[model samples]
Target: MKRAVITGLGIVSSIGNNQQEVLASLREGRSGITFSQELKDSGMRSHVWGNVKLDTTGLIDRKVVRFMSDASIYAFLSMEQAIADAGLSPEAYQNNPRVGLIAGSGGGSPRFQVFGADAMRGPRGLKAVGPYVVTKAMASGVSACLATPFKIHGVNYSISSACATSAHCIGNAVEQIQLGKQDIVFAGGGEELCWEMACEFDAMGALSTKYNDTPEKASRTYDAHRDGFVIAGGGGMVVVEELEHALARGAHIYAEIVGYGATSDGADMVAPSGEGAVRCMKMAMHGVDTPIDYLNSQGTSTPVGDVKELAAIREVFGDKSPAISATKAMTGHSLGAAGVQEAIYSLLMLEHGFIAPSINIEELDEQAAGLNIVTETTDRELTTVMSNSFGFGGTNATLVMRKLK
Candidate 1:
């Protein structure tokens, strides 16, 4: 298979808008959680969410912003940064022999809410909706928009792999390059914080309910007191450049994208399953012999889902699960953006040579759902790293990043 390297990354999340900003926030252990404006009337148990601040004046031309939502803005900004960071111009992007755009969206409700408000009044009064409604709301909108900016001609498609969408994008893009269909692919995931969904999860008793005064302390990954997950959303994009192209251009290499694994549960759509996550993970584990020094897990802090995910990790690393951390604790759960964001963080860890801690892995829950979740704080060497992401509808995906010699 052709090798893939993450050349550049752009992230706009509840934590920070750019790579440096986000890394700083992560190092300091900050939480973007706060009272959600979108859930004013939802009567949610925990009203904290990692929402992107409503400040687009610097990011976009507000005069022409129209009714666009935060999610769309994230997609546009991140794609712009990815293209710029890769030093690929419109002419170069268009001329690339093999180029593709793979974007992921966990859910598309920004357009629905903005336009669906009056769909209730009837078709005659549905003037608020337009052709761009679906285009803006489509799961692939991020990719489609990125492709359009440069007039990219290669395959442009998006996937809704639940929260694991972006990780799957990276994994599949590697496959595409290996197949010789594409040399380089611009890929990542984007999500907008939607309050309505948060209320629903809260009603389902899903978010960590422990930290009302200190939200950062609330995202205790494997802590016994984790009430549920804090909803979060944002956009992030990465330029997955082919190894040869990167070398030929003398580009800085972050890490090599190696194996990818993913699976889904046969039954139980909403409830997560450890066996199913393990099945998907086996795709990558079968190829590598060295131990994975660090892992970024989808520890969303929900009771069943968190435990189920740990079970899968234990299956892979066995007694070596102590090296893993739940990054979602700080950024909140970005849903579709979770996987890609984690991928970028893992890659950064590989490049910078220090693994960030999962923060609140202090207390253990029931013995059945226990593991060596990196709690307190840790800074250690990293050779091989992996990230796990699972989504609703029995979807799952994993990516393994190895040290590039």
Candidate 2:
């Protein structure tokens, strides 16, 4: 089996827009949540995510700007950073046919409403929305865009397994490399959360009901008094290299992409199964023989969803559930970006020798349950970490990371 090394990383979250800033924020145990302005009955659950909606300047061409939404911009930002951080230029990558791209999102945008409206309700009729409308709305556009930008000729497509989109993306990308399908793969996800989806969750009664105020702390992951998840928006990217190739190139490796396992809750399409999560984690560990010391969990803080996720974790790791941490406490739920954001956070923890805290876990809801949820402060020694994300429709994935020795 070939080894996969992470040569570069890019992250845009509620905490920061770049790796350096994100690392710093993670170190400080800072939470990027702010008071909410969008939802009602927020109960501190109304906070909009304190995320960076960056403007594309030198990183992207302005001519292409008019064609994309903010979510697409976020995706491009992270990919550019990873490309630069990896010390690879497009000109230099010309010889690399094994290069690939994979990106996806659960929610690319509700802005299409505007575009669609223009075409439907406006003067231009069907043509008003433009031809790129379908491409922009497609979940696969994120990765397809990367192949074009990077000039990659290898495997390239998007995956939309909801919040697990990026985790599965990375997992599949690694397979492509391990099987000699590709050597370099840019794999992750992006999400643009507009009020439309937020309204949907709200209708389902899955919202941060603390909308009264304290919006920044709306996503209190394990807090006993927590109401629900703070719908968040963000994106991330990672540059992956086959282990043998990385070693040959003498590239500095932060962590090794050791194992990836995925399963689904056949019992309940909507409700996640504890056993499924356990199986995935066990399979990942089984692949690498690494004991999990920390778990980047998928604690979204929704009514049943969050609890189902935690139940899955405790079923396997038990009481010492590996210093479990939930970042949705700060970033809200970036949906498709959740896996990538958490992966970025996991990488930062391994690289920095510290594990970030679940900032708003005021009380470990006895019902939703909690583990040794790291809160408000980081601990040391995160050499081996497991990041898991369980998306809607029982899409589950677990990714294991270890410091490169």
Candidate 3:
């Protein structure tokens, strides 16, 4: 069986656009959440958002941008960075059948859907709707756009499992490599910030509304005063390559992916069962002797969700739990991109030898009292790390990675 290793990483989030900037943001505990007037005007409970403010003027060609939605654009930006960081030449993957892409979003671009609908109701009717509407609005648009531009010819597709979307994509990418089906794969997820998605989550009472004035404090993961998660949008990508292939190319390896686990709760829709998360974490850590030194938790800050995730951690590691922190406390929840974003953060910590703090927690939740929750940025060498992501529809995914010695 082939071994999978991560040679490059890319991220476009509210905190930062690239790896270096994101690393600095994490180290400084900077929160990307800000008050969104659009969300406020929508009359939803949540007024704050972790929105990516990027100027895409010349980032991509207009010819290709015409068919891409915001999510697809984000995915493209991240993929572009990953490909460059991996030192992959155009000839390496272009028209190559051994390279693939697995990426996607939680849902298609709702903004595009609304646009098409409004155009249909206009004076021009159907003529006003553009031909690229379907292409831009499809859930698979991110993957399609990524693969087309890079010419990834093997196992090119996307997966949609809400917040766990990217985690599942990366997990499947690892499987493809381990099975020798592909030598290299780009795996990640993206999401667009729109009032439509905010409205839906707000309607379900799932967004934080109390810290609109102090937006940076909105995503209070595991904090006693936490209301709910602050909605966010962005994308993250990782270049997963076979160990021997990466070595042959002299790629700088960040970490080696040792295990991945995914599972679904048989019982709930929106609510998570600690049982499923427990099993998922255990499955990821299977056959691993090195204790995990750090953990990037899927702590969305929702009252029930935070408590449930803590319980799951307790069940998995008991009193020997790893130092845990939620990057969403600073980046908010990136939805479909969260799994990859957290995984990237974990790898960064592993490579850089530090644990980023989980900020905005003035008072820790009682449920998280016994855990080794990292509240301040700490400098420490790390050997192994785990990132967890759970989503709606009771889906859960976990990835375990080890620093390359």
**Using Cα atoms with residue i matched to residue i, what is each candidate's TM-score against the true structure?**
0.91, 0.92, 0.99
The stretch of ten residues in a row with the least summed lDDT in candidate 3 is 145-154
Q: Where does candidate 3 stray beyond 4 Å?
A: none
Which 10-residue window of candidate 1 scores lowest in summed lDDT?
61-70
Order by TM-score, highest first? 3, 2, 1
Q: Candidate 3 vs. truth: CA RMSD?
A: 0.8
- Kindly provide the TM-score of model 2 when superposed on the true structure, using C-alpha atoms: 0.92
Candidate 3, after superposition: displacement of residue 156 in Å?
A: 0.8
lDDT of each residue in 1-405, candidate 1, tens digit only: 678888878888887877777776666666767765456556666757788765767656543233344565686678777777778767767855588888868776654655555664666565646545665666666676566655677768877787888888888788777787887887887887765556666777777655766766777777777878888888888888789988897777777877788787877777887788888777877777777888888888877787888777777667666477788877788888888888887877777776667766666767435465665455667888888888878888988888777
lDDT by residue for model 3 over 280-307, one digit each (tens)? 9999998888998999999999999999
* Alpha-carbon shift of residue 120 in model 2 (angstroms): 1.8
In model 2, what is the error at residue 387, expressed in angstroms? 0.6
Number of the top lDDT candidate: 3
